[PDB]
Structures are given as structure tokens and as C-alpha cells.
Amino acid sequence: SKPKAVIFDVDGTLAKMGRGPYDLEKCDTDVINPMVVELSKMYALMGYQIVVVSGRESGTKEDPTKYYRMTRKWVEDIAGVPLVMQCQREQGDTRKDDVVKEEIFWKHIAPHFDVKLAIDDRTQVVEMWRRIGVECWQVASGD
Amino acid sequence: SKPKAVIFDVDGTLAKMGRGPYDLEKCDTDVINPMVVELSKMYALMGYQIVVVSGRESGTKEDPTKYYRMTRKWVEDIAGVPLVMQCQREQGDTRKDDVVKEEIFWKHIAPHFDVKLAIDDRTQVVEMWRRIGVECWQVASG
Ligand SMILES: [Mg+2]
Ligand SMILES: [Mg+2]
Numbered sequence: 001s002k003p004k005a006v007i008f009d010v011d012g013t014l015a016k017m018g019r020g021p022y023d024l025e026k027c028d029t030d031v032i033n034p035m036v037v038e039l040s041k042m043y044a045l046m047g048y049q050i051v052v053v054s055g056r057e058s059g060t061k062e063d064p065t066k067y068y069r070m071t072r073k074w075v076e077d078i079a080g081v082p083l084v085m086q087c088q089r090e091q092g093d094t095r096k097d098d099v100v101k102e103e104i105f106w107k108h109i110a111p112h113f114d115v116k117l118a119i120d121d122r123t124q125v126v127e128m129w130r131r132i133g134v135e136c137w138q139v140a141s142g143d
Numbered sequence: 144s145k146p147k148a149v150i151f152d153v154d155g156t157l158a159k160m161g162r163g164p165y166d167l168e169k170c171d172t173d174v175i176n177p178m179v180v181e182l183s184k185m186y187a188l189m190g191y192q193i194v195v196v197s198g199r200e201s202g203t204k205e206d207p208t209k210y211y212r213m214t215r216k217w218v219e220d221i222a223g224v225p226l227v228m229q230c231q232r233e234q235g236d237t238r239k240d241d242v243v244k245e246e247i248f249w250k251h252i253a254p255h256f257d258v259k260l261a262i263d264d265r266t267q268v269v270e271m272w273r274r275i276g277v278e279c280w281q282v283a284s285g
Pocket of ligand 1: 011012013122
């Protein structure tokens with residue numbers, strides 16, 4: 001009986017989409033998506049553990065966690081999401097989001113949490129969560 | 144300065160979809176979609192006005208609000224959702240869900256509420272909400 005959890009995505013979900021999508025160097029200035037961010041705070045107060053998962057590459061070759069650290073600072077200090085765990089696509093991983101996010105899920109999250117719900121904006125990712133038996137709410141079209 | 148509201152759909156959203164659509168008298172025995180129903184309680188507690196909107200025809204030719212009243216009772220008594228307003232397809236309206244729900248929005252919801260969010264399951268409707276500038280979360284495939 002693992003503690004109950006909710007997974008949130010970052011891009012398009014917690015954070016709005018102002019810059020280039022793969023231009024992570026400017027991602028520290030992203031704008032919060034208010035209802036989704038409020039949702040994460042709501043779930044945390046209700047005793048769900050919040051887990052953040054992003055397809056953002058963690059960094060560059062010379063700085064492998066550069067973007068992970070930027071993302072984390074944005075989530076924690078700008079959005080104020082009270083997460084207990086953050087997971088990203090490792091530097092050099094070029095597979096599709098749904099493939100990576102599924103791997104992250106089975107390897108790092110599922111053994112520790114009982115994930116009741118995932119929040120995301122991309123159809124391919126949304127269908128993956130649903131397919132492996134995780135309720136998922138799509139919060140935007142994803143285009 | 145209107146009160147903030149969240150719109151919830153009923154079929155496939157608040158209620159799981161053992162019964163057929165348009166068989167609305169076996170409708171009283173629907174089972175809750177728990178994460179969504181819990182959401183509506185949370186929002187209500189956080190001071191949002193809960194507005195339930197549904198494509199279900201409101202009743203029969205003989206009784207124009209028979210189905211409306213059945214839906215209302217399930218939402219209030221079984222789901223436990225503290226709603227403030229309920230809007231459905233009028234008896235004998237045969238237009239599409241998204242045309243009906245949009246007309247409901249302009250005439251009965253938008254004048255009284257600042258709608259911050261709509262929760263729904265059907266793609267055609269979800270697209271309508273986003274198209275008219277209302278954030279919408281799609282909680283299952285449609
Ligand atoms: Mg995203
Ligand atoms: Mg529906």
C-alpha cells in the first residue's frame with residue numbers, strides 16, 4: 001500500500017507556452033498556468049504526494065543537469081509547487097516523450113507511489129498514461 | 144466582478160459510462176467517477192461556484208423536466224456535489240452537444256459567473272470551450 005500521488009507535467013501544463021520549445025536556456029522566465037498550479041497545491045494539502053515529470057532534456061553535454069536545475073528552481077520558486085520528486089529526460093535521450101515518461105514511471109515512480117492521476121497537455125503522453133491504467137486529465141490541446 | 148465558477152459535465156465526467164446513452168431512466172443508478180467528483184467537492188470548498196452542465200435531454204414530451212430532476216438528484220444525493228446551478232438540453236432540442244452547451248454558456252452562465260474552468264469528456268465539447276476561451280480539462284477520451 002504505497003502513498004497516493006499525482007503526476008504533473010511542466011510544459012503546457014504547470015507552465016504556459018513565449019519562447020522556443022527546445023530553447024530551455026530561457027525557461028526560467030516561463031509563466032505559470034494558474035488553475036493547474038493551484039491544483040497541485042490543492043492535492044498536496046489533501047495528502048497526495050506531488051511528483052513532477054518532464055520531457056525537457058536535463059541539460060547539455062558540458063552541463064548534464066543544467067536544465068533540470070532551472071526547471072526545479074522555476075517549479076519551486078516561481079510556481080511554488082510543493083513536489084516531493086522531480087524526474088526528467090536525461091541528457092542525450094532522444095526517444096519520444098511517451099516512451100521516456102513511461103520508463104521514468106516504471107523505474108522511478110511506480111515502486112514508491114500509488115499514482116492516482118496524471119496531468120498533461122500532449123495527446124501522445126495522455127494516451128500512454130491512460131493505456132497503462134492511470135487516469136489522466138488533458139489540460140490543453142497540446143499543439 | 145462576478146463569482147468564480149467551474150463547469151462540470153455529467154456523462155463520462157462526474158459519472159462513469161452498464162447502461163446506454165439516451166436511456167435516461169436507468170440513469171439514477173450511475174456510479175461516481177471518484178477523482179472528478181472529489182475535484183468538484185474541493186472546488187466547492189475553495190469557494191468556487193459549481194455549475195453542472197449536461198447534454199442529457201431535460202425530459203419527455205409529456206414531462207419536460209423528468210430527466211433534469213433525475214440528474215439533479217444523482218448529482219446532489221449520490222455524487223454529493225454541492226452545485227449552485229444546473230443546465231441541460233431542453234426537451235426536444237436535437238442540435239449537437241457543443242452547440243447546445245455553448246448556447247447554455249452565453250445565456251445562462253457567462254452573465255452571472257466568471258468561469259475559470261470546464262471539466263468534460265467529449266472532444267467536440269472540449270474543443271468548443273477552448274475555442275470560446277474557457278480553459279477546459281478533458282478527463283477521459285471522447
Ligand atoms: Mg507538456
Ligand atoms: Mg460528457
